[model samples]
Target: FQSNAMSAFITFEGPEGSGKTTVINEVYHRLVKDYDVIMTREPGGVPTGEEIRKIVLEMDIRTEAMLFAASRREHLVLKVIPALKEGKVVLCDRYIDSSLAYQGYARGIGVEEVRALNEFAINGLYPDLTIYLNVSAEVGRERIIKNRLDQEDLKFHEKVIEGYQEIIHNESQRFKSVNADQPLENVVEDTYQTIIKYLEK
Candidate 1:
């Protein structure tokens, strides 16, 4: 009674204060119980990628965008594609859609340009599923201000959310929006349930 395990590639997308990381942590912990799971954050957590993350997040917008594309290319080659081919479920935080949303549309660099660069990077590799953690710009900004008072200002956060919305609209099939406006527990629970549903299929 053996069946080839259905490997799932899941991604979490949202603005900085949208609770993407928190939900991902919860889902990762829950899924590890019964599935072969590997979790990572794109443009981060790996040596080369870590360097890229610093450049993109901390640099000027256009420069950040260019470096981000390069980072995505490297990450897919070194991390994401391998885990998927090995039949392990891969959970990623902020993949291409994020860049397309944040850097492309929000930053006004054009989602198509960012998408083109990213497509070149990954050769069109994308997540099997993306959980779009939802939040209004005002609420999301407040959340960030509460935690990191001086970290980032309002305008940046607004643009980032806009970027995310654009990506979600453009790639409807790949993304599933979760109301991040809920309480922390509720957010985590909904995200966990989504992953479980996919894992069981």
Candidate 2:
């Protein structure tokens, strides 16, 4: 019925080949050493959310939007909330921002309307900090192709990047962008430092 943003509900966002998981893992390993930490992802986080993912990835635009919101609600209530209640740092690979940027803006659903839906779902349990792995679509596209990830074209990914840029601009204070077009070591270092600054506070 209540929530505290100070629980360090941090989240990371990036395109398919932005090396987001690697960065998150590195940050988690470092943070876990001296802080209480938990790492999770969207749509497949809790058991219920995993079930929701099966249905979600499998919609009309609004239908798809609500499915993500449903999964997000379950993940928040069942998984992230407990960590927050326990006073642990929560590092989520994706969160409300993904839905807002991709499904909301990129898919033409309207960010404000999607935010209203998520507001009901989350009950004000927003992230304390958000990390955006900033990478050009060209760089991300090349990596995804080489890595043999899910097939996505450059134009589509460019739209996603555009949406994310708008989000960071509008909500600048909540986001800490890490230039992902660098060596893994550098990206990891930047991400970890940004996180520790928030956690130490």
Q: Model 2, range 1-201, lDDT digits (tens) per residue? A: 665445678989987678898999989999889877889987544888898789865659898888889999998888888889888889999988888888888888998998899899899877888999998887887777777334455666888899888878967678889999887799999999988787777
Q: Flag regions of model 1 displaced more than 4 Å.
A: 1-3, 44-47, 51-60, 148-152
Q: Candidate 2, which segments miss by more than 4 Å at Cα?
A: 1-6, 148-152
The alpha-carbon lDDT assigned to residue 162 of candidate 1 equals 67
lDDT of each: 0.80, 0.84
For candidate 1, what is the lDDT?
0.80
Model number with the top lDDT: 2
What TM-score against the true fold does each predicted structure earn?
A: 0.88, 0.90
Instruction: Tell me the number of clashing residue pairs for each predicted model.
Output: 1, 0
> Which clashing pairs does model 1 show?
101-163
